[PDB]
Design a binder for these strands. Structure first.
Lengths: 106, 99, 81, 93, 94, 106, 84, 97
DNA sequence: CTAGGATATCACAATCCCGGTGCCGAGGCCGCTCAATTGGTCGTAGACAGCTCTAGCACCGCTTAAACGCACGTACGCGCTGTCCCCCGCGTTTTAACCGCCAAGGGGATTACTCCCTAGTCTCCAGGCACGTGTCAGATATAGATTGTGATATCC
DNA sequence: GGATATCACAATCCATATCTGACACGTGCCTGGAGACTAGGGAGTAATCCCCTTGGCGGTTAAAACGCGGGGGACAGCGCGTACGTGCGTTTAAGCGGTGCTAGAGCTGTCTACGACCAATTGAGCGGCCTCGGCACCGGGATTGTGATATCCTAG
């Protein structure tokens, strides 16, 4: 038995996403391509976020992604900052940004 | 004469020290008591899970820091560095929290 | 320093929150307004959390209830469910 | 009882992207919640799109339009390209 | 011919019930109809989400009551809850 | 054959609201008490808005509710103003107000 | 069909003056207008695109008012008084 | 001869335009602006004669709200003149760029 | 000479890098079980032709009201000073957060029966929409009255 | 000098024609909603086990609060200069109407393909546990950043 994820070449599940879509009260019937396409987009977004988080973690000389790393990765990218416009990340801290006026004048 | 830092540099040092950690800034027990007395007014004798109070603390800390960023922007706008309650009121009234 | 529990949010705690936010100098009247603002925010979140809890015929406020109450206000919280 | 989260799949994606980087439990929970939130965003937008045109189905066209509406700018183009690639590879066995 | 539907007659009935001598314009009527549709959709969406949260498959009066208490704040929630409960009791008493 | 709107005493339709609920893909099955309750709440909200709009229209010596009157009624009541927090009313104008500092000093 | 260019200047300075007067502004600087002509030109570029996305999805070539209403509602800016 | 001191005409305009409900931007310039903006995304579009009106109403409301916030920001700075920095600060606080 | 100012120089304290451990949270192996897949049918909805017809589009004649260009002056924003007063920074000590274990004991998740209500379908008949048509309250225009602002006159 | 006071002018509101587009009402008509009957499944109830939240005690011990001295910064004051509002005069698209035209919107008919359902099979994944390595504490030592201080220079 070959799963639909294997045929589509995605890491994210296709059967589980299809079941969630069909048992989630979105439409009467749900096409076979919608689940695959949505799984592909979800996998792409997760890959982007994890790549940026890994870069941030390597910048701090660590080999484990923490919520702080994810906050740093998300808030240092325009597209992901727009996607995370109103989302709080637990235990993620804030970007280091001191205003120019507060800086020592001389 | 004991060493005494100029007024202001300690503030910048602790600003740099606190924008680097992810700890919880409000003490856990006082926040839990505040949450419990506030919830007491809506349903008598409510039980809070050990994670609901933590989630409330994280959300409130994020909200207050986000409000203080805009308060700082407003204070700098008026050619100041000190934040005063009018700055907080303006920052809240621009973004839409009527009170 | 009790006065119920609203001064549980101690003045150094508000100073720490301001320092994290990026504030260099804080006036002396900021603390009362900050306490009031935090009390209002907690009231608004906890009312919705308690409504969600009592809708399900439960007496325990679950972390998921607070997550839903935050999601209802456009303040999505990641890390609790 | 089972939880049916997205831990294994996010772990697989991270391992194929960064081979030597691990992920903490809190970060894994954050990523799981992020995937869920995006999934309901896209699904709700697709449902409203299907209901606007009096349609009673969610076809890959609807998910494509929902992706173009939610994801901002450069994310949308890469997402739609990879989704089209996945669909084409699936329909070709 | 199309048969597009709207809450025009019901809004007019309510207006004549609360203001017998006052009419209403066409643009204002469209505004009221849009507002009614928006509130209905918002309440129904919140109620459906609440039903999905508890894994319950039926939207009962409890779900709509809680949705109203969540969306409509302040004194409107109490008045709307009283009105709905009175209407439900009247219907159950035939 | 008495309509369900008559039994509950509500002017808004109960059958139409029930059909909209059932065909809007909100739940797999919907109780009969939801439609009546929702109709009652909708009727109360419409009655409140129309009452305030009529009061505003009388205040301006007019015998017809206009979008301007609805905007004035909505924004001159804190409860409905919060209910209309992010809502634009077409051809409604804004509340007549002038800030204190802009007013003449002497 | 004809191509259009340099039309943001069509939003004249008196129009911005009247818009600010409605908003309750007494005195206006000289550098507002250009800045305003930018801000407006962002808002439309963030709405019309969505409307276009809502139009070409239905295999249409007409941007009806309902598509614009849906695009505005998709931004937390619900507009009452245009269709449903 | 006869002249109004600066401000009085401004107050008259403020009290007049706030009372009115009409549109403050002309129709043809706004229609041409909308068409040239939409030309970038999809070519050969056709706006209904009401979609342009809806866009005009939405844009006017957004600009009026922005100018209200800008006036608040200007009054905060102990001034009565709105400046581009005021608009930028208002848009930064509201959360859009 | 005498005073008051930038400019280069030194000792103190917080920061950051380099390891030495303890450990605690993450990576990896198993059980099994619950959900995904595969094979056929059906009835459903989406897709292709097409055909009216209907609304957006293009152009123009023109009336004119809004806009653009200028002169001018005045009122506000910007800039420089003094100051006092409010916040910062530091020292000490009383206080309240906190980690650790415990005993309830109140509440929550699960399962078996069930019975109440909600789903599916047919008739029909009465309510809601389309279509006209008559009545009127709002938009427009004058005309008179009241008011808010500004130029002018007198005094302290 | 300017501070108060007093009348004249432009803007606006209000009372009356008046004019008409706009809304309230009476007929078709047609379609959807209410009643009746049958079926099933979803949530209420009752019991049960155990999960996990709360109250209590207790020794730490680090945070915090009270005060005290100092400094720098927010505010009140003045000066100015410049740029922005107010009015005039002329030009120029705008709004409106009127016409014609052409593409595309909507609905009906038919074709087809495709997704839900249903059942049996099987393997992918979640909970459990077991082991290991990355991290955080901690201690030490460079490494600076900084506040105070000696050094040199210019006007009166």
């Amino acid at each position: 038995k070959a799963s639909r994820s294997a045929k589509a070449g995605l890491q994210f599940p296709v059967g589980r996403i299809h079941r969630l879509l069909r048992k989630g009260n979105y439409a009467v019937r749900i096409g076979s391509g919608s689940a695959i396409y949505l799984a592909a987009t979800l996998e792409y977004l997760c890959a982007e976020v994890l790549e940026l988080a890994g870069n941030a973690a390597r910048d701090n000389k660590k080999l484990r992604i923490m919520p702080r790393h994810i906050q740093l990765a998300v808030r240092n990218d325009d597209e992901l900052a727009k996607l995370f416009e109103g989302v709080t990340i637990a235990d993620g801290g804030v970007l280091p940004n001191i205003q120019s006026a507060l800086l020592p004048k001389k | 004469k004991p060493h005494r830092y100029r007024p202001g540099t300690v503030a910048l040092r602790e600003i740099r020290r606190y924008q680097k950690s992810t700890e919880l800034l409000i003490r856990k027990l006082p926040f839990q008591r505040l949450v419990r007395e506030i919830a007491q007014d809506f349903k008598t004798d409510l039980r809070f899970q050990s994670s609901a109070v933590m989630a409330l603390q994280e959300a409130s800390e994020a909200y207050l820091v986000g409000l203080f960023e805009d308060t700082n922007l407003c204070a700098i706008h008026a050619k100041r560095v000190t934040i005063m309650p009018k700055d907080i009121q303006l920052a809240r009234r621009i973004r839409g929290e009527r009170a | 320093v009790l006065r119920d529990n609203i001064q549980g949010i101690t003045k150094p705690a508000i100073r720490r929150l301001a320092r994290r936010g990026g504030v260099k100098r804080i006036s002396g009247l900021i603390y009362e307004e900050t306490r009031g603002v935090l009390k209002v925010f907690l009231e608004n979140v906890i009312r919705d959390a308690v409504t969600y809890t009592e809708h399900a015929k439960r007496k325990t406020v679950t972390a998921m209830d607070v997550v839903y109450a935050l999601k209802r206000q456009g303040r999505t919280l990641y890390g609790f469910g | 009882s089972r939880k049916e989260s997205y831990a294994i799949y996010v772990y697989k994606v991270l391992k194929q992207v960064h081979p030597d980087t691990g992920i903490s439990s809190k970060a894994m929970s954050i990523m799981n919640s992020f995937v869920n939130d995006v999934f309901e965003r896209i699904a709700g937008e697709a449902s409203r799109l299907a209901h606007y045109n009096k349609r009673s189905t969610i076809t890959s066209r609807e998910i494509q339009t929902a992706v173009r509406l939610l994801l901002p700018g450069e994310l949308a183009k890469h997402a739609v390209s990879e989704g089209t690639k996945a669909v084409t590879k699936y329909t070709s066995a």
